[PDB]
Amino acid sequence: ILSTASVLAFERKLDPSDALMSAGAWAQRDASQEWPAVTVREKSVRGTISNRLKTKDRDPAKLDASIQSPNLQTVDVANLPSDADTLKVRFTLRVLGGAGTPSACNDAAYRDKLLQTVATYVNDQGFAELARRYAHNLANARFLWRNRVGAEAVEVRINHIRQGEVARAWRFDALAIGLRDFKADAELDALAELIASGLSGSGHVLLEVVAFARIGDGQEVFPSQELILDKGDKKGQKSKTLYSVRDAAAIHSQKIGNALRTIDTWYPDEDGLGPIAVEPYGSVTSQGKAYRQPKQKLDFYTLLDNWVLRDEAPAVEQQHYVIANLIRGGVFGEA
Amino acid sequence: VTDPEALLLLPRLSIQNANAISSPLTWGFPSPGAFTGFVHALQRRVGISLDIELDGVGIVCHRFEAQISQPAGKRTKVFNLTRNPLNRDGSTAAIVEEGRAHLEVSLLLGVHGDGLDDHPAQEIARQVQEQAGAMRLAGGSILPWCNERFPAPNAELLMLGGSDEQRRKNQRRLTRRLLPGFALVSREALLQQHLETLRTTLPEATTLDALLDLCRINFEPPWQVRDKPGWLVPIPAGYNALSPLYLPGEVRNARDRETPLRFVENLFGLGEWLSPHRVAALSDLLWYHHAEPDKGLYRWSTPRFV
RNA sequence: CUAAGAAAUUCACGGCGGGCUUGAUGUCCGCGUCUACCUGAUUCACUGCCGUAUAGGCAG
């Protein structure tokens, strides 16, 4: 009957490291191994109430009384030095093999059928499109996020590390490569071939990704913010806390992974957003809305179940979406 | 349970986000069960192909860093979390708190078999290194040291030296390699001795109170502090049986249907962090599995230490 | 076969108004630092000549 597995899990393929942030001057990007790190500092901010009022605080006397109480906060801030205009973001990326193999799965017939489905996908077209989109997300500085917004020029340098040295080196102009269009380029095709060979291999392929963004002299950079629950303590806390590994501002690994996963342009809604991160039930945290709802037949679980159990193979784009979810991983399976 | 013919020093491994939730009652460094399971996975993946056996692990913790913060006005600590993806209805999911930490460790793997004579030591050490370079140690990825000043090579040393002086020099140089760190050992005998001392101090005292007393900072009036022999962390010592051993197909929603499943619960023991110079041989730091499936007691420990 | 497997914290912010720290003061008596050494190991790979020569020889 080929019942679906009660416990299903997939290992996270294509896992990056923390994006270390460092600062320097442009046209010295080559000798950037000794660039000083960007440090997270402390500063005091005094604001004023600017949020919406609930029709009972709109009395002028209460508003003036609440303004007369100073609103003080302590925030973590990261800045470029007052003589450095370039932010260097460096992280390491492992492209693991055994991409379609589940990490944990109950039913052995479901094992054979799922591995047969992945084998059909890989010998039909393989990871050609998926690794193309991942290499595009590497080539443009999507992992900088807000650091990519107002940069004069962004250059991404990607090096293949085989044993201890650069086997093959890439250099891209991130602002020329779009954040929503996946064209074809020769160096991009070479990077896609390397990533696809890493996904189809039995070991791993190591890449280091170094992006230089010309933010501005002494401007304010944006490391990943840390999620800390207040938990109803009586003392006032610092409102903003930035992430750092060793006295050096950094971006979270899952933030970089979410940036790399932004390849899904096949969701049923219109591509006004463009690509979105590959997730089950197509959730977008910034938009607060989950595309690929299960009421439509385009969510990951129903597509996978139709593909592997009832042999209802979806469209090629939906097959790419399902295999991209397999790359992403996750804990699956009903009770 | 056995004497290794050689020691395999996995070099400084940068572990990114390790599970800082070691046990239901302890936090911080990951459980030794994670390291023993990682070594067993190394044996299951590459150890069989090399005709060797990888049993025993030495944990040194060259660097530790947990993603924690201390709220203002509180002396305790909280764990920094991650923003999970939204639900299918666009709302924030319920937060499940997990602790994630940064490690830098080097592992001493006990090697015994015929592949040591069948293959060169550098070759098997290397192949184990690039096998471990695509794995996980405590739920976190392993950073493989690309484009730094110089990577640390893997080094396998046979314990059967040509002489006692040569063996002693090799042990001291291997200790010098993993110097900025602290070896992790288990202190079950010390915990029992302290429990007997506590029982002579006052009766009906359980070993949980002895374990708590050996880790807390005690203040005594004339105001002094009761000194501790070492670092004396509380560590999970294994798993104890909580249910009769079920057949592989009895338990619904198991990991597989080929392995028996038994419900367990954590066993908490005593551990110590100490400098590697204070051990007679580096093979005394190796952590081994001790299952004994008849009575439960699915334990990991480091025997032959003292 | 690792309390296994999975994860975007994030948008915005004026901390400043002002101020006499001054009064007085003994550091101090005493003291054995000795003894004994190869800097030098080829430690000046130097000056000139024949030859276009960095190729290669020769002179004290």
From TrEMBL, chain B:
<dbReference type="InterPro" id="IPR013398">
    <property type="entry name" value="CRISPR-assoc_prot_Csy2"/>
</dbReference>
<protein>
    <submittedName>
        <fullName>Uncharacterized protein</fullName>
    </submittedName>
</protein>
<dbReference type="Pfam" id="PF09614">
    <property type="entry name" value="Cas_Csy2"/>
</dbReference>
